[PDB]
Design a protein around this nucleic acid. Structure first.
Ligand SMILES: [Mg+2]
Ligand SMILES: [Mg+2]
Ligand SMILES: [Mg+2]
Ligand SMILES: [Mg+2]
Ligand SMILES: [Mg+2]
Ligand SMILES: [Mg+2]
Ligand SMILES: [Mg+2]
Ligand SMILES: [Mg+2]
Ligand SMILES: [Mg+2]
Ligand SMILES: [Mg+2]
Ligand SMILES: [Mg+2]
Ligand SMILES: [Mg+2]
Ligand SMILES: [Mg+2]
Ligand SMILES: [Mg+2]
Ligand SMILES: [Mg+2]
Ligand SMILES: [Mg+2]
Ligand SMILES: [Mg+2]
Ligand SMILES: [Mg+2]
Ligand SMILES: [Mg+2]
Ligand SMILES: [Mg+2]
Ligand SMILES: [Mg+2]
Ligand SMILES: [Mg+2]
Ligand SMILES: [Mg+2]
Ligand SMILES: [Mg+2]
Ligand SMILES: [Mg+2]
Ligand SMILES: [Mg+2]
Ligand SMILES: [Mg+2]
Ligand SMILES: [Mg+2]
Ligand SMILES: [Mg+2]
Ligand SMILES: [Mg+2]
Ligand SMILES: [Mg+2]
Ligand SMILES: [Mg+2]
Ligand SMILES: [Mg+2]
Ligand SMILES: [Mg+2]
Ligand SMILES: [Mg+2]
Ligand SMILES: [Mg+2]
Ligand SMILES: [Mg+2]
Ligand SMILES: [Mg+2]
Ligand SMILES: [Mg+2]
Ligand SMILES: [Mg+2]
Ligand SMILES: [Mg+2]
Ligand SMILES: [Mg+2]
Ligand SMILES: [Mg+2]
Ligand SMILES: [Mg+2]
Ligand SMILES: [Mg+2]
Ligand SMILES: [Mg+2]
Lengths: 124, 147, 134, 51, 51, 51
RNA sequence: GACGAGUAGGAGGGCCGCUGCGGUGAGCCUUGAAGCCUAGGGCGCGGGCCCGGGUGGAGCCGCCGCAGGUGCAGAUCUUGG
RNA sequence: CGGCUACCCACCCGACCCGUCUUGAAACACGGACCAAGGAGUCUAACACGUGCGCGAGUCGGGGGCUACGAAAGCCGCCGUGGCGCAAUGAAGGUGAAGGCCGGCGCCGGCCGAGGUGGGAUCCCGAGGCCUUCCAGUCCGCCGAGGGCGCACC
RNA sequence: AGACCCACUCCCCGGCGCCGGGGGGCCCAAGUCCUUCUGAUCGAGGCCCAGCCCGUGGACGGUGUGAGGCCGGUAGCGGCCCCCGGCGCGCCGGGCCCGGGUCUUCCCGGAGUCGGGUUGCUUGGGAAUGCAGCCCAAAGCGGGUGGUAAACUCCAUCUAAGGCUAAAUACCGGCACGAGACCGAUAGUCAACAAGUACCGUAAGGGAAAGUUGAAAAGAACUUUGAAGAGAGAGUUCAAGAGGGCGUGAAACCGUUAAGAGGUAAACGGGUGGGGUCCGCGCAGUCCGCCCGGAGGAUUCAACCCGGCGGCGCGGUCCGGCCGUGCCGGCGGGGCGGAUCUCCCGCUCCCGUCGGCGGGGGACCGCCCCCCGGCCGGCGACCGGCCGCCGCCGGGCGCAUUUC
């Protein structure tokens, strides 16, 4: 399930990293990149993910489907968004809120998307 | 493991958890059970009564096979045979009673302790207790002695 | 991985057997790879170095395309000396610089009666090996 | 594998006597268990007002 | 739980074949990392040469 | 140090089979395999059965 | 909300420290590791730890578990200076 | 210009050298020039207690046998022989762990059947009541006088 | 041994001679490919749509770092050569011409030994387990043993005082090997090195300290002061800040330079003040969202069209599949177990038969596998195709009071 896997991953996963009184999680679909039951991207049936695109512009959003829980190859669908910051934020906000697809971390996804967007622009 | 033992947290303490007035000497009270009659009298009387002295007769060449006689109780008597034996005997209308050869199971003596269900039996044992036999007779059954 | 229980895998024993090997084993150990022309001609990948072979240098400060003949094979130091791979000393006298056979490619073999039969045996063994493969 | 370690209802056919160890709990989905009408109905009102 | 899925068999080329066998009940056995760690700890000492 | 240190430890067979059964059961959960760190992202399905 | 002393002694927490083993960091590293020195910047109550500068030339560490020949100021302590 | 902290100096207050034995140590009590490295409750077996895991009136292959790491790992079950537990008491001969009621002549057939009291966490019933205009009114809950069958345990 | 019946010959060596498991020798795959650091690469990037080549070979070691592919080896039921071996044949010489059952007749046993008494040692052996010394010292339906001495009386079990025998078993000496959760030069054997050596004791014996130049000696030509030790230049090396006990190079200790202080021994905790060292790459001091206004620049928003993807109970009750650690029915086809019962074969007693044991077979029960049908639940450890809603992406129409 979810809690069953969490009780094993919480202190044993390879993505886990502890140092300087802090612990994180480097799993590919972890918003805020911190080790918690809320933001883990492997032990949940439905998961969202915000990553920078292959090109230096845009953001790719990864969503986990419903059928292929045991099929990692087809479990994730990647959608590339390349537009203005306000439109991208609206698109992600609608994608999570109006689909009711894990609405617990929609704000965290928006924060990550904004952070990626400001990082992609040229730095003065 | 030595990692979790108390010695790891005793470093830095001079006496290593053994006292400063009376140091941890080698054998302050003798070796082993020394002085059971003299200075360990209180311990050997408050915790080992009957320890000193002989009693009874002496059996020089004792062999356990002669006195070997495991016992079983009537509550476990039906457990020796399979369940289908008991259910068929209960369902049986001709009054035939199952024969329980406790010797084949590996018990020589039968002791009557628990309640015996109302069902005819034929217990074929090597020894019988008085109460065991009367319980079998009372519930309806037979006792067969074998050598 | 190795499966023969009679062959060592211990580092200490292998080093001891290498640095205390007798001269007739030093000869086989100090073997140099043949050139592309030589291997495609005699079908032999490598041969022990000899006293009168024309060789090049592949790695080191003296590497290049120049061809030089060996002058002696100092098997005690795992070293061979070449015709013109040398440096001057303080007093000005020129002394050759030791080069390991592993970084030496043989260009022309000083083939003899024994050298030819060694090459034929090695070629025969690898040919029957390839045939056994398919 | 089924013949080696046996099914839940079928014991192992190659071991002398073995069967899969029974679960201490079956429905491991704690969130689904908590977010059900049966439990939520028989609950007291929350007190999330920090004093 | 109680369900038993149907795991397909892939050919050498990669694509899924027509063969499809049910999941053995062993794969739904309880997960006990405590027991696994205890067993691994105690069994890894049995191949240890003395010193 | 003496040669007769208790190097070897024995474990009950029931829990020996308990551990491997739990290991096999955990081998079919994608979260627990990625937690182990194997690159398995594009694998068609974790219970990888081949012809 | 209340409380905070402490010898011998007991217990608990150590993201305190050392060595090796199983896993793990697509870990570090001749574009410089360990070790050592440092009037350098700090953190942690503390055990200690992370960066900066100089020598070094070949190995080294973090996390999860396992194991110990695992922490010195003394013992008219041992060896060496 | 800022930097408590880490280098040096100056001043005010405090300030006897550590360890150990001792009721009492800075002691005119003993050990101690300084520095580096080594250095002291470990291991085997037995028992007891407490805690973790598996199985459970059963439990255990520790010996033996079958099939690089692997001298591992898996399997035996008509290899559980055997250890521990399931029965105690007596020196031993040995013995070895509920009964009550009804009818006939201590014995025969049938019935009830495996303790009682006090305290006992929890559970069961419910005299009524928990309001939105007011009355009767049902269903789902909640609280509750009082009454019970009473875990473990004493 | 005799008589009467049955009954076999191929046993055994050893001399000679023809056939298909070890001891060593010699060998067997694949990059020094293109750039790039370096002093040297075994470092780093790439090698296609043969994702460089080999792989039954990615153990290890060496090679100027850290190499599957440079070399030795490594894997291989891989190859060739020499010596020897246990087998399976042939002749040749001789050795023995040997066996079982029934009946009849004879024979048969180990002595200063057992045992008894005593003494001493040992053992758990206790009115004496075992062993030994002294004394006595035998018998043959006898003797020994039967864990309390003795007497009597029936039993049970062996035959002492003669001897041989592999196997399973022990191994800190020896030969050759493999390995390690061990030690890493004050550790580990006393000894990693010219170690039981140097060295001490008359002797028996005691018994050390002691590893690291550099990749390669390339071990510093030559000039200069001094007799020389040894300096100053120069040169080798990436490096002499590696110069022949030479990797790294701490502390105690000492010199020099720089800074400060100094008559209550030095040193220490709290609090400041002053001086130095560097740090803040500081010395006109943070921006982040929303709104207003001005200068601008875009192929531009919303709303529609098509295609794709996802979610959603959509559809109170769409259709089809799968599972149950759910159940029911079965003129279904099976495997496991049973201390539930019951035609055939083998074995023994009796004159093909009556009465017995073992095995097989059949029936019955429990569980499980598969097939069919009917319900319940799930698909949120386990879904497919339509329809409905929503979201997202791409391509168009969109045309600037929208949008960026
Ligand atoms: Mg103390
Ligand atoms: Mg104590
Ligand atoms: Mg003391
Ligand atoms: Mg005392
Ligand atoms: Mg003691
Ligand atoms: Mg007295
Ligand atoms: Mg080989
Ligand atoms: Mg306190
Ligand atoms: Mg160690
Ligand atoms: Mg200092
Ligand atoms: Mg080197
Ligand atoms: Mg010291
Ligand atoms: Mg003062
Ligand atoms: Mg003292
Ligand atoms: Mg004293
Ligand atoms: Mg005194
Ligand atoms: Mg004192
Ligand atoms: Mg005084
Ligand atoms: Mg004195
Ligand atoms: Mg004293
Ligand atoms: Mg002194
Ligand atoms: Mg030390
Ligand atoms: Mg306990
Ligand atoms: Mg016992
Ligand atoms: Mg190498
Ligand atoms: Mg490469
Ligand atoms: Mg290599
Ligand atoms: Mg390579
Ligand atoms: Mg090669
Ligand atoms: Mg004696
Ligand atoms: Mg008698
Ligand atoms: Mg005899
Ligand atoms: Mg004899
Ligand atoms: Mg003999
Ligand atoms: Mg091994
Ligand atoms: Mg030394
Ligand atoms: Mg050293
Ligand atoms: Mg030594
Ligand atoms: Mg030394
Ligand atoms: Mg040195
Ligand atoms: Mg050294
Ligand atoms: Mg240097
Ligand atoms: Mg150096
Ligand atoms: Mg070096
Ligand atoms: Mg030095
Ligand atoms: Mg001065």
């Amino acid at each position: 399930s979810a809690h069953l896997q969490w009780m094993v991953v919480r202190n044993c996963s390879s993505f886990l990293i502890k140092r300087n009184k802090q612990t994180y999680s480097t799993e590919p679909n972890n918003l805020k990149a911190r080790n918690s039951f809320r933001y883990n991207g492997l032990i949940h049936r439905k998961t969202v993910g915000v990553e920078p695109a292959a090109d230096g512009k845009g953001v790719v959003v990864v969503m986990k489907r419903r059928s292929g829980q045991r099929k990692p190859a087809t479990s994730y669908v990647r959608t590339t968004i390349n537009k203005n910051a306000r439109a991208t934020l609206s698109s992600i906000r609608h994608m999570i809120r109006k689909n009711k697809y894990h609405p617990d971390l929609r704000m965290a996804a928006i924060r990550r998307a904004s952070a990626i967007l400001r990082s992609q622009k040229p730095v003065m | 493991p030595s990692r979790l033992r108390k010695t790891r947290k005793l470093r830095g303490h001079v006496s290593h958890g053994h006292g400063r007035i009376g140091k941890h000497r080698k054998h302050p009270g003798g070796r082993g059970n020394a002085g059971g009659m003299h200075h360990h009298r209180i311990n050997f009387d408050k915790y080992h009564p009957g320890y000193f002295g002989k009693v009874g007769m002496r059996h020089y060449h004792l062999k356990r096979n002669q006195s070997f006689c495991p016992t079983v109780n009537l509550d476990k008597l039906w457990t020796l045979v399979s369940e289908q034996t008991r259910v068929n005997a209960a369902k049986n209308k001709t009054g035939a009673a199952p024969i329980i050869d406790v010797v084949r199971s590996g018990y020589y003596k039968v002791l009557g302790k628990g309640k015996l269900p109302k069902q005819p039996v034929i217990v074929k044992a090597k020894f019988f207790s008085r109460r065991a036999e009367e319980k079998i007779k009372g519930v309806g059954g037979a006792c067969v002695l074998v050598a | 991985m190795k499966f023969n229980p009679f062959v060592t895998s211990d580092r200490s024993k292998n080093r001891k057997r290498h640095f205390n090997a007798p001269s007739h084993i030093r000869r086989k150990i100090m073997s140099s790879p043949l050139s592309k022309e030589l291997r495609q001609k005699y079908n032999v990948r490598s041969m022990p170095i000899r006293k009168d072979d024309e060789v090049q240098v592949v790695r080191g400060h003296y590497k290049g395309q120049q061809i030089g003949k060996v002058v002696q094979v100092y098997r005690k130091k795992y070293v061979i000396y070449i015709e013109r791979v040398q440096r001057e000393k303080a007093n000005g006298t020129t002394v050759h610089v030791g080069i390991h056979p592993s970084k030496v490619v043989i260009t022309r073999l000083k083939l003899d009666k024994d050298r030819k039969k060694i090459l034929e045996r090695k070629a025969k063994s690898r040919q029957v090996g390839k045939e056994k493969g398919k | 594998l089924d013949d080696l370690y046996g099914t839940w209802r079928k014991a192992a056919s190659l071991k002398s006597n073995y069967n899969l160890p029974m679960h201490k709990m079956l429905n491991t989905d704690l969130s689904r268990i908590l977010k059900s009408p049966e439990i939520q109905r028989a609950l007291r009102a929350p007190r999330k007002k920090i004093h | 739980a109680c369900a038993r899925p149907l795991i397909s068999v892939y050919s050498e080329k990669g694509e899924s074949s027509g063969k499809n066998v049910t999941l053995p009940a062993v794969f739904k056995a309880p997960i006990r990392p405590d027991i696994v760690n205890f067993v691994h700890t105690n069994l890894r000492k049995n191949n240890r040469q003395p010193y | 140090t003496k040669t007769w240190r208790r190097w070897h430890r024995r474990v009950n067979t029931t829990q020996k089979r308990y551990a491997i059964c739990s290991a096999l059961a955990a081998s079919a959960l994608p979260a627990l395999v990625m937690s182990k760190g194997h690159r398995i992202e594009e694998v068609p399905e974790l219970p990888l059965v081949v012809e």
